[PDB]
Design a binder for this molecule. Structure first.
Ligand SMILES: [Mg+2]
Lengths: 68, 373, 213, 77, 96, 164
C-alpha cells in the first residue's frame, strides 16, 4: 500500500514473473502520475535536486565509467 | 656433431640403406591387417609429427617388404597387407654419413632474446601488410638482416618473436636483403607457407620485384636488359667478385631489366630494376659497371663516383653518409584480394630518399605499372 | 659512419646489449622533463622516485614502475627480476643519472601517478571526518613532503592543499614524503583556486556538514 | 638389448594426438587394436631369429602367430 | 600536528585509570560501529540501481541486438571446417 | 633543526655521538645560530658513550628515554605525564628529575646501548597507527619528544592534574 501526500491509496498488483525492478517502475510511474495530480490540484511539491543519494550514485557511475 | 653428413646420390643412398643395420621390421598381425600406413605410423610413434611421417614415407626411408625379395615403396593412402614387414629407421640410423630429413631430429631453439616495448612499437610500425599467411615489413636503411660478425650488433633476424601476433611460433624471413637496402622484407607465418613461397625467389624469367635507385649519370639507353656472370671467391678479409660477359663453369649468371624513369641533366638519373636472379650486390654492381653509372651512395663500389661534385649542390661530399638509394619498391604475391588481382605490396621511400626526390622535383609516391597486380 | 649511426639507433632502441651514455637520449630527456616541468608531469601522469628501498616498499605495497634506471656496478632487484613484474630495466651511467635526478642512489623508478582521491568523499561523506589538515601556502618542497609524511603517520582523515603548494609529484616532496602519495589511507586533495574549485566554499561546506571547529 | 620387441599396449593419446588429420579420417579411427605390433631390432640370420624367438617367447611370422594360439586345452569346469 | 592528531583526546577522556576501568564494555559498543552516523542506513547500492534514460535504454537495446547478430555471425565464422570439427569432437567427448 | 627545537623549547645542553659535523655550514643554516647561543652547551664524548651517559645520568639524577622503534611504550604523552607527575610529587614533598632524550638512527647501535643502560630505562615511541609508513623523520620525532618532555610543560601538566 502506497499513500501519497494527498492520501490517495494505490495498490501495485504483484503477479508471477514480476521482478523487483518491475515493481519499482510501476510504483515510480504511478508516483509521477500522482505528483502531476498534486501539482494540478495546487499542492506544492519539493522539487528534485542534487542530494547525498545522487553523490552515492555518482560513486558507482565513476566505477562503471572506469570499468568500461 | 657426432655425425658429419656428406653428399649422396640416389645409388649411394640405396646402397647405404641396404648396408645399414639400424632398422626396425614391424610385422603386420591380424590386428593391423588393412590399416593405412600413415595411421599405423601415427599410432606406433607418438613422438613423430604427422608432417615428419609424411616426409619419411614419401621420400622412401620408411618402405615395406612384401616377402618378394624386393622392397616396396608406398604413399600415405596405401593399405597394409598381412604377413609383410614395414621397415622403419631408428635413431642410430641417422648417425652415419646419411643426412636425415628435418622433422626426424629435434632442433633446440636454445637462448632467446628479450625485446623492449620501444623495439616492439618499431616493429609494429615497420609492419605494412598483415595476412594469415604472409607478413610484409618495411626494413629501414642501414639495418643488418642477419646477425653479423659482431654479436652485440642488432639485427632483424632476432626481432622475429615480436611479430607473431597470434601464431604459436615466430615467423620466418623468406629472403634476406643487404644491410644498405631499404626495401620491403617478406616473412612467412606458417612453416608450410615458407616452403610454398620459397619457389618464387629462385631464378625466374618473369620479374616480380621493383628496385628504385638513383644513379650518378645517365646511361645510353632508357630501357635495357643487363646480364653478367659473377664469380665469388674467398679472400683474407672478405669476398672477391669477378664479373664476366662470357659464361664459366663456376660462374653464376645475373640478369635484370632496367628502365630509366627520369634524367637530371645527365648527371643524375632515376631508374627501376626488375631482377630475374638473386646474387650478392647484384643490381648495385650492375648499375656500377654495366650501366657505367653508380648509384648515389655506393661507396663500396666506386666510392669516388658515388658522391659526385655534380650533386654536391644538395649533399655534402665530405660526409659520405647519405643512405644508399636502393629500395625494394614493389613486390608481388601469389595471394589474391577480393577483386581478383594479385596482391602487390609497395613500401614507402625513406625520408632521405624523399628529400632527394623533393630537391630534384620528382614525385616520391608513384605507382609502377610495369609489374601489375 | 654506418656503424656509429646503427649504434646510436640501438641506443635510442635500447634493445638489450647497450647502456646509455648521452643525456640527449629520448628516455633521459623524458625523465628530466617529467622532473622539471610540472605541467608536462601532470599531462603525462608520471613521476620520478629515487631510492631502492623506497622502490622495494612500493613494490611490496603493489606499485611498480614501467621504467627503472639502474646505475652501473649495482645488481638488479629481485622484485624487478621476478616474473610477476613488467618493469623494464635500463643501465645508466653516473653523470647521466645525475642529469636525470640531482640525487642518484643508483635506482630511479618512473612510476605512474596514483589517481587522486575523488573529491566526492569530501563533498558528501557518509562517515564523519574527525580531524582534517589544511596546508596553506607552503614554499619549499621539503616542509611539504615532511608534513605529508607526518600526516600519513598520524592518520588524518583528509589533507587539503590550499591556494599555493609545491607540486606534490615533485622529486623533493616525493623524497620528503616517502610513500605518502602512493598510500591510500590519508586522502590528499590539491584545491587550487585558479582551477575553478572554491577552497573556502569547500571548507565551509565540510564544517557545516561534519560539525567541525 | 632384446632382439625382438613384443607387442605393447597402445599409449593413451592427448587431444591433438587423438584428433584425426581430417573429419573424413575421423571414421577410420573407429576400429583400432589396443596393442602395437611386434618387431625385430636388426638384420639377423635364421638361427639368430629363431633363438631370439625362443628367448623372448614371441613369434615373428604373423602366419604362425595366427595358426598357433595359446589356448588352454582343458574343458571349462 | 602531534597535539591535534586524530584520537589525541583519549588521554583526556578518562580522568583516571580507575574511572576508566570502572566502565564495562558490551556488545552494543561493537554494534554501534556498523551504523553510519551522518548518512542514513541503506541495505545495498550497486550498479543495478543506476537509472537509465530513454537514449540509454535505446542504446542498450541496440547493443544487445548487435551482440545477438555478432553471436549469429560467429556461429558461421567459427564454422570453418577445422574449428567446426574441433567443437564437434569436444561436444562428443563432453556428452560421452 | 633538532638543536633549534631543543633550545627553543628550553634545553640546556646536547650530546653528539657519531655526528657528522657539529659546526658544518649546512647544519648552521638549519640551526640559525642556536648552537652559537651561550645558554646552549654542546658536548662530545671520546669513543666512550655508555660510560659518558650512565655517569652523568646517575650523577644528575635524570631519567633516560630512548626513541626506539620497539613497541615497549608507544604513548609518549602518558610517559611524559608520568614523569611530570613524579616531578610534581617531588615538588609537593619538598630533588626533581630531568628528562634525557636519546635520538638514534641504527637499531643495532641503539640496542648496543639499551642492553647496557642503567636503571631506570624506558623505550618511548610515537603513536603511529599506519602500517604503511615505517617511521617519521628523525627530526620530527625528536621535536615531538622535546614537546613532550619539555621542562616548561610540567606547569601545564600540573594544570591538567588540577583540572582532572
Ligand atoms: Mg638453374
Amino acid at each position: 500500500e502506497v499513500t501519497w501526500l494527498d492520501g490517495t491509496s494505490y495498490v501495485p498488483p504483484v503477479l508471477e514473473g514480476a521482478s523487483s525492478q518491475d515493481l519499482i517502475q510501476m510504483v515510480m510511474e504511478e508516483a509521477w502520475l500522482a505528483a502531476d495530480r498534486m501539482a494540478a490540484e495546487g499542492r506544492v511539491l519539493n522539487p528534485l535536486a542534487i542530494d547525498d543519494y545522487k553523490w552515492d550514485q555518482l560513486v558507482v557511475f565513476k566505477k562503471v565509467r572506469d570499468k568500461e | 656433431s657426432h655425425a658429419r653428413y656428406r653428399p649422396l646420390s640416389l645409388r649411394a643412398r640405396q646402397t647405404l640403406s641396404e648396408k645399414s643395420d639400424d632398422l626396425q621390421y614391424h610385422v603386420v598381425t591380424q590386428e593391423w591387417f588393412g590399416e593405412r600406413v600413415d595411421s599405423f605410423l601415427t599410432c606406433h610413434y607418438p613422438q613423430w609429427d604427422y608432417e615428419t611421417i609424411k616426409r619419411l614415407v614419401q621420400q622412401g626411408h620408411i618402405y615395406r617388404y612384401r616377402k618378394n625379395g624386393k622392397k616396396k615403396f608406398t604413399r600415405l593412402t596405401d593399405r597394409l597387407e598381412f604377413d609383410e614387414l614395414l621397415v622403419v629407421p631408428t635413431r642410430a640410423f641417422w648417425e652415419k654419413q646419411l643426412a636425415p630429413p628435418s622433422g626426424v631430429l629435434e632442433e633446440t631453439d636454445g637462448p632467446k632474446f628479450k625485446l623492449s616495448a620501444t623495439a616492439r612499437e618499431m616493429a609494429h610500425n615497420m609492419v605494412l601488410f598483415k595476412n594469415e599467411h604472409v607478413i610484409v615489413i618495411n626494413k629501414p636503411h642501414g639495418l643488418p638482416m642477419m646477425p653479423t660478425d659482431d654479436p652485440q650488433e642488432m639485427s632483424i633476424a632476432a626481432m622475429l618473436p615480436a611479430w607473431k601476433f597470434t601464431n604459436v611460433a615466430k615467423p620466418v624471413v623468406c629472403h634476406n636483403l643487404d644491410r644498405e637496402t631499404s626495401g620491403c622484407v617478406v616473412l612467412a607465418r606458417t612453416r608450410n607457407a615458407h616452403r610454398m613461397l620459397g619457389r618464387m625467389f629462385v631464378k625466374r624469367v618473369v620479374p616480380n620485384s621493383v628496385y628504385w635507385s638513383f644513379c650518378v649519370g645517365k646511361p645510353t639507353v632508357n630501357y635495357g636488359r643487363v646480364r653478367m656472370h659473377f664469380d665469388i671467391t674467398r679472400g683474407n678479409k672478405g669476398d672477391i667478385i669477378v664479373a664476366r660477359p662470357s659464361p664459366t663453369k663456376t660462374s653464376k649468371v645475373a640478369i635484370a631489366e632496367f628502365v630509366v624513369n627520369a634524367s637530371a641533366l645527365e648527371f643524375g638519373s632515376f631508374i627501376s630494376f626488375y631482377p630475374l636472379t638473386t646474387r650478392r650486390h647484384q643490381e648495385r654492381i650492375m648499375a656500377a659497371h654495366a650501366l657505367r653509372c653508380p648509384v648515389l651512395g655506393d661507396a663500396k663500389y666506386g666510392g669516388d663516383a658515388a658522391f659526385p661534385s655534380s650533386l654536391s649542390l644538395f649533399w655534402d661530399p665530405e660526409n659520405k653518409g647519405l643512405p644508399l638509394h636502393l629500395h625494394h619498391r614493389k613486390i608481388q604475391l601469389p595471394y589474391k584480394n577480393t577483386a581478383g588481382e594479385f596482391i602487390c605490396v609497395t613500401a614507402p621511400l625513406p625520408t632521405q630518399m624523399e628529400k632527394t626526390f623533393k630537391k630534384l622535383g620528382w614525385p616520391c609516391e608513384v605507382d609502377d605499372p610495369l609489374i601489375p597486380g | 659512419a654506418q656503424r656509429a649511426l646503427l649504434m646510436q639507433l640501438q641506443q635510442n632502441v635500447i634493445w638489450e646489449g647497450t647502456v646509455i651514455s648521452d643525456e640527449r637520449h629520448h628516455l633521459i630527456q623524458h625523465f628530466v622533463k617529467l622532473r622539471q616541468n610540472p605541467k608536462y608531469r601532470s599531462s603525462k601522469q608520471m613521476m620520478v622516485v629515487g631510492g631502492r628501498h623506497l622502490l622495494h616498499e612500493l613494490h611490496k605495497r603493489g606499485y611498480t614502475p614501467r621504467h627503472l634506471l639502474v646505475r652501473e656496478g649495482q645488481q638488479k632487484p629481485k622484485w624487478a627480476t621476478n616474473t610477476g613484474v613488467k618493469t623494464e630495466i635500463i643501465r645508466v651511467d653516473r653523470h647521466v643519472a645525475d642529469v636525470c635526478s640531482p640525487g642518484n642512489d643508483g635506482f630511479i623508478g618512473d612510476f605512474d601517478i596514483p589517481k587522486p582521491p575523488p573529491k566526492e568523499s569530501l563533498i558528501a561523506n557518509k562517515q564523519r571526518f574527525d580531524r582534517v589538515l589544511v596546508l596553506d601556502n607552503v614554499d619549499d618542497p621539503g616542509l611539504l613532503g615532511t608534513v605529508l609524511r607526518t600526516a600519513a603517520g598520524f592518520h588524518y582523515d583528509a589533507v587539503i592543499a590550499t591556494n599555493h603548494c609545491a607540486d606534490l609529484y615533485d622529486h623533493r616532496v616525493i623524497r620528503a614524503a616517502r610513500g605518502a602519495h602512493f598510500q591510500k589511507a590519508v586522502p590528499i586533495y590539491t584545491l587550487k583556486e585558479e582551477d575553478g574549485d572554491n577552497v573556502y566554499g569547500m571548507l565551509n561546506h565540510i564544517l557545516q556538514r561534519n560539525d567541525l571547529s | 638389448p632384446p632382439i625382438i620387441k613384443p607387442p605393447l599396449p597402445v599409449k593413451v593419446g592427448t587431444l591433438a594426438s587423438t584428433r584425426p588429420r581430417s573429419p573424413m579420417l575421423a571414421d577410420e579411427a573407429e576400429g583400432r587394436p589396443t596393442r602395437l605390433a611386434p618387431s625385430v631390432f636388426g638384420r639377423h640370420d635364421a638361427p639368430a631369429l629363431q633363438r631370439a624367438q625362443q628367448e623372448c617367447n614371441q613369434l615373428i611370422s604373423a602366419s604362425a602367430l595366427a595358426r598357433i594360439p595359446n589356448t588352454s586345452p582343458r574343458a571349462p569346469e | 600536528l602531534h597535539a591535534l592528531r586524530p584520537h589525541g583526546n583519549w588521554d583526556y577522556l578518562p580522568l583516571h585509570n580507575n574511572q576508566e576501568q570502572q566502565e564495562t564494555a558490551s556488545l552494543e559498543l561493537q554494534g554501534m560501529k556498523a551504523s553510519v552516523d551522518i548518512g542514513p542506513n541503506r541495505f545495498d547500492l550497486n550498479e543495478k540501481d543506476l537509472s537509465l534514460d530513454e537514449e540509454e535504454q535505446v542504446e542498450k537495446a541496440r547493443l544487445d541486438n548487435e551482440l545477438m547478430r555478432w553471436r549469429r555471425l560467429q556461429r558461421a565464422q567459427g564454422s570453418d571446417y577445422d574449428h567446426w570439427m574441433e567443437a564437434e569432437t569436444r561436444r562428443i567427448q563432453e556428452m560421452a | 633543526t633538532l638543536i633549534r627545537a631543543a633550545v627553543e623549547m628550553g634545553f640546556e645542553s646536547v650530546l653528539l655521538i657519531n655526528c657528522l659535523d657539529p659546526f658544518g655550514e649546512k647544519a648552521l643554516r638549519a640551526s640559525e645560530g642556536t648552537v652559537f647561543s651561550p645558554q646552549f652547551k654542546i658536548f662530545e664524548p671520546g669513543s666512550d658513550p655508555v660510560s659518558a651517559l650512565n655517569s652523568i645520568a646517575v650523577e644528575h639524577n635524570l631519567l633516560p628515554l630512548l626513541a626506539l622503534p620497539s613497541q615497549k611504550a608507544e604513548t609518549a604523552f602518558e610517559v611524559a605525564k608520568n614523569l611530570h607527575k613524579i616531578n610534581a610529587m617531588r615538588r609537593s614533598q619538598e630533588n626533581h628529575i630531568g628528562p634525557l632524550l636519546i635520538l638514534g638512527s641504527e637499531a643495532k647501535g641503539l640496542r648496543d646501548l639499551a642492553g647496557e643502560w642503567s636503571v631506570p630505562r624506558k623505550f618511548v615511541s610515537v603513536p603511529l597507527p599506519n602500517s604503511t609508513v615505517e617511521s617519521l623523520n628523525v627530526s620530527v620525532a625528536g621535536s615531538i619528544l622535546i614537546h613532550a618532555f619539555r621542562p616548561a610543560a610540567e606547569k601545564h601538566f600540573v594544570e591538567l592534574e588540577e583540572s582532572a
